[PDB]
Structure 1
Amino acid sequence: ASAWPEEKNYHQPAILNSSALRQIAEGTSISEMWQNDLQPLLIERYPGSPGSYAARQHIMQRIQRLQADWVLEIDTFLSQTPYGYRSFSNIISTLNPTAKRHLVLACHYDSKYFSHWNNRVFVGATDSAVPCAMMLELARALDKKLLSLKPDLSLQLIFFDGEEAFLHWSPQDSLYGSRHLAAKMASTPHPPGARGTSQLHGMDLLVLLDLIGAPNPTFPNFFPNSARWFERLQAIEHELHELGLLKDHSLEGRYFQNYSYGGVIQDDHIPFLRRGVPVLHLIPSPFPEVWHTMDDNEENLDESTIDNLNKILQVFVLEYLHL
């Protein structure tokens, strides 16, 4: 009876030296992400809307043009909602589908529904168009390294639909895509042919990005079973900082501080966490001041902070995958 699902407990990163860190810092382009990955998502895209379709096509197209062997799946399903039955579509992008273990990066691509107000439309820039764009830029920037995966461990990206409540949060009105996908993965044998292990056992760690893009974010270390990985983000941030590879950044104003948060934050990680999946929740506390406001737009995003976080996340992923 293989103990492979326990490998994630002992998994260690292969740390990048200074030369490699400089390479990663130089290999990501915040202006290219801004134009090519982010702006096309700064549109109204609540579930079922034309914008949802447009956002999904954009995410799929940006991944499809890459050299690495990404396998795209659209996970479409029905759920009851305050507005009756509706359809939702999660986007899953996977390298090495049969690999037993995957490091998983995720965010939600839907935008919260709001009737237009005084000619303003809610586009959820930090929530979560930026996280979507960061995942797309990571796939682009690391494409040559990821192509080499073509340690039975690889990478998966999930863009959840329906994270937002159609009204205000309630247990039944929110997390449509993640409640559905967590249940589906929990009941899907993995690897193919397995007798008693599921796709959830294969999830080494779920790194969920949400509400990223405002100035001065502070991310708390939420969970003890992923605290050692939170510490790696702190170390990566510290070293990139010391090497002069971050912009408009100080250690007093660092993003990953030494502090926990014992309360529960409702987000897409919940259905996974409650089924035993380790989660590294990259959501700031407090939330951006523009949270769920028409001001959560492009103008209020902090470019250098997003650039810095792209560098930190890309190093984290390469170190985890030993690339």
Structure 2
Amino acid sequence: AWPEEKNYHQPAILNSSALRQIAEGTSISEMWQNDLQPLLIERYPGSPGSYAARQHIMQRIQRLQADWVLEIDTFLSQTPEGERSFSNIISTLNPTAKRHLVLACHYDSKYFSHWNNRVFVGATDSAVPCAMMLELARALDKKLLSLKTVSDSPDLSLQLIFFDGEEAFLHWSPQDSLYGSRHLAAKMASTPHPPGARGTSQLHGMDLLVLLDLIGAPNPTFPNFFPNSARWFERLQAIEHELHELGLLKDHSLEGRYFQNYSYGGVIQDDHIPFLRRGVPVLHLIPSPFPEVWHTMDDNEENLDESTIDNLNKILQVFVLEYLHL
């Protein structure tokens, strides 16, 4: 019955004092310098920047006190440019815990021919989401360190996934996209969890996939995409509203809020699709419309909005703490 626990799981909602502590515990300037800027490089699969981004993400995680278990899921696949190597980065607390909240983004950058000595670094797409996850891991390190403490009073922990190969090499298609996520979802579907279990897979273990994509532009509007995650989307709205009321957000208005009541009219393709089609609940934190700079050379550092990202860092960290009861 444990794969059904996610359906009844409740947050442990934090009081004003705790919310102030979280808002002050995260540093947008240290994320910018130590987590974001090293990723603002060309990093399509197999590029020098692909290897550098991987090493940077792993190094930033390994320096933390929490008991993170890093795994690199490396595989070959045919592409339009030819057989390429892809490496997903998985970072897991308590790997044998039956349940994980999963935060994820893609760390590859889309390939574009250089033009006018300009290189696409995909600042929103998705270097900022990578940096946000690393900053969450740092800001919450002491609280996450307590997950190492066995105590029988749920069997639930945190996992981070940095997908490789999200972007098409040529034109987006079922066989020219989602290289890392299609591979990892298939592998997880085939892998018993907990080890030795009968019937249940690692995908049953995924309580909720929170996929960050195209974050960093000013005035993002996130639609509530899915009914089976809508109650969790509403927690993001309530956290945003409460942090704003408490004066803990910068350059933020109620009419210019991020998390929207309405849903979306189409189906966005992204790294969550291979998980969603196999029953995993998904909270797809992608804006609609996409950033103005999307898939242009102007998706760069200069066009990021620091206050927006800082605000979203605070909202995400509260959400994660409340989900995990920390």
Shorter-chain TM-score tier: over 0.9
CA displacement 1:230-253 (0-9 Å, x = unmatched): 000000000000000000000100
Give the equivalent residue in structure 1 for 2:235.
Answer: 232
Q: CA deviation at 1:262?
A: 3.2
CA displacement 1:246-301 (0-9 Å, x = unmatched): 00000100000111013110100000000000000000000000000000000000
Q: CA deviation at 1:306?
A: 0.1
Determine what percentage of the aligned residue pairs are the same residue. 99
CA displacement 1:114-166 (0-9 Å, x = unmatched): 12111000000000000000000000000000000000000000000000000
CA displacement 1:162-203 (0-9 Å, x = unmatched): 000001211100000000000000000000110110000000
Question: Hey, what's the Cα distance between the residues in 1 that align with 2:81 and 2:155?
Answer: 43
Partner secondary structure for residue 118 of structure 2: coil
Could you tell me which runs of 5 or more consecutive residues in structure 1 were left unpaired when the two chains were aligned.
none
Equivalent residue pairs, number: 321
Q: CA deviation at 1:78?
A: 0.8
Question: Hey, what's the Cα distance between the residues in 1 that align with 2:268 and 2:90?
Answer: 23
**Mean alpha-carbon deviation: is it higher for 88-97 or for 165-174?**
165-174
Question: Hey, what's the Cα distance between the residues in 2 that align with 1:263 and 1:193?
Answer: 40
Question: Hey, what's the Cα distance between the residues in 2 that align with 1:242 and 1:175?
Answer: 39
Question: Hey, what's the Cα distance between the residues in 1 that align with 2:225 and 2:195?
Answer: 33
Question: Hey, what's the Cα distance between the residues in 1 that align with 2:56 and 2:93?
Answer: 19
Question: Hey, what's the Cα distance between the residues in 1 that align with 2:115 and 2:50?
Answer: 20
TM-score w.r.t. structure 1 length?
A: 0.99
Q: CA deviation at 1:304?
A: 0.1
Q: CA deviation at 1:85?
A: 1.2
Question: Hey, what's the Cα distance between the residues in 1 that align with 2:105 and 2:36?
Answer: 14
Question: Hey, what's the Cα distance between the residues in 1 that align with 2:100 and 2:202?
Answer: 9
CA displacement 1:92-119 (0-9 Å, x = unmatched): 0000000000000000000000121110
Question: Hey, what's the Cα distance between the residues in 1 that align with 2:242 and 2:97?
Answer: 31
Give the equivalent residue in structure 1 for 2:208.
Answer: 205
1:265 aligns with 2:268: yes
Question: Hey, what's the Cα distance between the residues in 1 that align with 2:260 and 2:227?
Answer: 15
Moved over 4 A (4+): none
Give the equivalent residue in structure 2 for 1:127.
Answer: 125
Q: CA deviation at 1:33?
A: 0.2
Match of 1:100 among 72, 77, 98: 98
CA displacement 1:66-89 (0-9 Å, x = unmatched): 000000000000111011211100
Partner secondary structure for residue 319 of structure 1: helix
Partner secondary structure for residue 159 of structure 2: strand
Q: CA deviation at 1:212?
A: 0.1
Question: Hey, what's the Cα distance between the residues in 2 that align with 1:257 and 1:237?
Answer: 11
Q: CA deviation at 1:35?
A: 0.2
